[PDB]
Every structure is written in C-alpha cells, then in structure tokens.
Design a protein around this ligand. Structure first.
Ligand SMILES: N#Cc1cn([C@@H]2O[C@H](CSCC[C@H](N)C(=O)O)[C@@H](O)[C@H]2O)c2ncnc(N)c12
Ligand SMILES: [Zn+2]
Ligand SMILES: [Zn+2]
Lengths: 298, 113
C-alpha cells in the first residue's frame, strides 16, 4: 500500500486468485474519495492512460498492421476519450475499430453504432478492449449473479474472433461481471484483474487476458474467482493516485513487430504454444479487414 | 444553391457571448513535443495543449457534412495542438486559424516563415 501509489494501478495478486471465497458485498474504504487529476483532464482519459501504462508491462504481441477493436467507446458527451488514448498509445498505422450502442464522434479508423451483438467481422483481432457498462446495473434489486447481454457476446467474440497470442481487457465492476469470462481467462497464458489508481475508489477493474492460447491451460470457476476479486478489493484499500499521469515519456506502445502466421489448429504444438505464451507470435489470416453492423428493418 | 454555413454560425454565436463547444478531449502528454499544428501523436510543447482531432472538429461535433468535395476531415484520427491560452475553445481556434504549409506550424502562432 502507498508504494503502489507511484504505479499506474494495482493488479490482483496471484495468491488471491488461488483462494475459494464466498461472494460478499463490496464495501470500499476509499469510497467517496477522489484523485486529483491534472488541470482539464477527464476521468476517462486518465483511466485509459493508466490502463495502457499497465499493459505496457505485459507481454503483448505487437505485429505490423495491428488490429485493435474497442467496445463501449462512446461517452454521454458524444465523444470517445478512450479511443483517443488507444489511438495515441497504439503504433501509428494500427487499425483501430470502435463501437457503442449510442452515436458518438471518434478518432478511430472506423466506427460502428448499435448493440455489440449486431457487430460482425470477417477477420480476427490482435487486441480487444471493452468499456461496456449497462446503466441498469446500478439497480441492486436481486442478488449478484453472473450477467449476460454484452458479456455473452464478448465471450463468443473472444473464442471466434481473437487471434492466438492476442490479448483482451474487459471492464467489470462488483455487479457487472460474467462467470464464463472468468472461466475464459484460463484460456490465456496469464491473466489478472487490474484497478486503475485514479478510479481506485470504485469496484471497477479490467479483466486482462494475456496471449490467448485458444484452449484452457487453467480451469477456473467464474463465481469463485469473482468472489476472490471482491475479497481482494474488500481487504486491500488502494490509495487514489494520479501520479503516473505526469510521466508520459515512455507511454507509447513499443512496436515488437511480432510475427503473424496462418496455421491450422492441428499444426499447433508445444513449441508454437511456447512462442504464443511469450507474446512472440500471432496466429491469424493476414487478409483485409472487413466489418459490418446488422440493421433491423420493421 | 443553398448550403448551410456553420463556420459563420459558430463565430457569430461566439461573438454573441455564447459558451464555446466543450468536452473536447485533452490528451496527457509530455509537452516536450514538436509543437506542430496537426499531428499523428500529441506534439504539444510547453505552450500548448494536445487534443484529439475529432472532438475539435466543428463539422464532426455538429453531425454535419465537411466543406470539401471529398467531405474529408483533416482533424479526425489525428491530434491538434492548441495554445494553452486559447484552450477554452479548441473548436473556435482551429476554425479561425490556419496551418502554415511549409513549416507545418500555426500561422501566427509559432510560425517563423
Ligand atoms: N448493455 C449494454 C451496453 C452499454 N454500452 C455502452 O457502454 C458504454 C459504457 S460508458 C463508456 C465510456 C467510454 N469508454 C469513454 O471513453 O468515456 C456506454 O456508451 C453504453 O452505450 C453498449 N454498447 C454496445 N452494446 C451494448 N450492449 C452496450
Ligand atoms: Zn471532422
Ligand atoms: Zn511556416
């Protein structure tokens, strides 16, 4: 604690992942506190920056002509702050597609408006980002159960549309979470729940899968693991810090020029899996990027 | 023969004492950058703030066509450097000012050409 204040945020410690806990209500000590952001900086710009600052510390395949898709990109201000950061963070020439349920203005290469379930793409993707949050989640009516809707879409999209070696970051909260998505984290070389230092007073975290392996290396119970996450958040107060926002010197994503290779699922071996896990390899087709959004007529 | 002129519309709205367009996206950067007007990555220097291009484009923000046969937008997808003193109205600035072709800086701000 407070040593972390100089970090972009705090990741859920491995020991907490290995527990088996019962889901309790999340009560944060720092609830109501606010970090002091630089003059004129939006919370969501600060938030996305720290997320990227953390992602810089992981092993991410960063191929030429990288493909990145961003769900829940629009704000109530009608702009896309998070997309702008991703744009800044990603290597120039990276294809960035973003989407939201509501209309917004974006700096992305292409933007799709509508429910995420209406979104289809031909090709696969190197990096997937989701800030999607259901405003109705704020209703505490029932108990806390695994959630569906866009969460169901994301799990499917990951399995079908994510390249091997690819990585994801999916925003969750106490009440906005899904069990299969946790289970799906075991299909990655590594995974964590990351909490930004600026938003540390919130149950918000990003589920980060690292280097998608397409098959489970680890078996995970989604209900148990989410209970583990809440337990971690409950017993570990995080000090709100805007500190890391002030050094942007090393911020840009280093371009690894990671290799891209098209293989059948039978050609994949422990030597290949090794390369994937180290973020030295991407497996997908190199074709052009084609997306679409289904429109209902009535 | 009719086309709406938004450029004039906003300028007069401003001159009328109207509140400038807000929620332009300001980027975190080093402020050691080259200071050029429109760039691929935030280039702001000590005197500048860097913004996301699309949020500073009047035509983008107002959901209207862009003024050119191609309808091309030279802001969106890029970043724009606004002098810190003018940063309360980035849209107004980009509208009223002009980028020097040879040195790539703002004409009247940082252009020695
Ligand atoms: N349920 C549900 C859904 C909720 N969203 C979007 O998620 C966003 C959560 S706030 C995002 C803040 C933004 N990243 C920023 O930079 O400020 C909203 O724009 C909402 O429209 C959806 N989009 C697509 N399909 C859906 N099913 C939903
Ligand atoms: Zn525009
Ligand atoms: Zn000049």
């Amino acid at each position: 604690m407070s040593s972390q204040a100089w970090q972009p945020g705090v990741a859920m410690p491995n020991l907490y992942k290995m527990q088996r806990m019962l889901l309790e209500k999340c009560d944060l000590q720092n609830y109501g506190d606010s970090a002091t952001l630089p003059k004129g900086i939006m919370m969501n710009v600060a938030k996305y920056t720290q997320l990227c600052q953390y992602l810089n510390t992981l092993t991410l395949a960063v191929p030429y002509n990288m493909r990145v898709i961003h769900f829940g990109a629009g704000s109530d201000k009608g702009v896309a702050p998070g997309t702008a950061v991703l744009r800044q963070w990603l290597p120039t020439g990276t294809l960035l597609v973003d989407s939201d349920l509501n209309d917004f203005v974006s700096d992305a290469d292409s933007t799709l408006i509508g429910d995420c379930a209406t979104v289809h793409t031909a090709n696969k993707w190197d990096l997937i980002i989701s800030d999607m949050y259901d405003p109705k989640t704020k209703n505490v009516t029932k108990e806390n159960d695994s959630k569906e809707g866009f969460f169901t879409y994301i799990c499917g999209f990951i399995q079908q549309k994510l390249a091997l070696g690819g990585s994801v970051a999916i925003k969750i909260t106490e009440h906005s979470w899904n069990a299969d998505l946790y289970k799906l984290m075991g299909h990655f070389a590594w995974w964590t729940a990351f909490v930004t230092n600026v938003n540390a007073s919130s149950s918000e975290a990003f589920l980060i899968g690292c280097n998608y392996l397409g098959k489970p290396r680890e078996q995970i119970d989604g209900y148990v693991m989410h209970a583990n996450y809440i337990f971690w958040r409950n017993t570990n107060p995080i000090q709100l810090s805007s500190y890391s926002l002030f050094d942007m010197s090393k911020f840009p994503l280093k371009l690894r020029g990671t290799a891209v290779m098209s293989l059948k699922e039978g050609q994949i071996n422990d030597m290949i899996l090794s390369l994937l896990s180290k973020g030295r390899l991407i497996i997908r087709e190199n074709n052009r990027v084609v997306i679409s959004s289904d429109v209902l007529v009535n | 023969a009719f086309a709406v002129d938004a450029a004039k519309a906003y300028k007069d709205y401003l001159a009328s004492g109207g509140q400038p367009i807000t929620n332009c996206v300001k980027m975190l950067c080093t402020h050691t950058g080259t200071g050029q007007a429109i760039t691929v990555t935030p280039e702001a220097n000590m005197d500048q703030e860097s913004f996301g291009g699309a949020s500073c484009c009047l035509y983008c923000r107002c959901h209207i066509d862009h003024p050119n046969p191609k309808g091309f937008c030279d802001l969106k997808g890029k970043y724009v450097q606004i002098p810190t003193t003018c940063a309360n109205d980035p849209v107004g600035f980009t509208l009223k000012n002009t980028v020097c072709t040879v040195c790539g800086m703002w004409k009247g701000y940082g252009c020695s050409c």
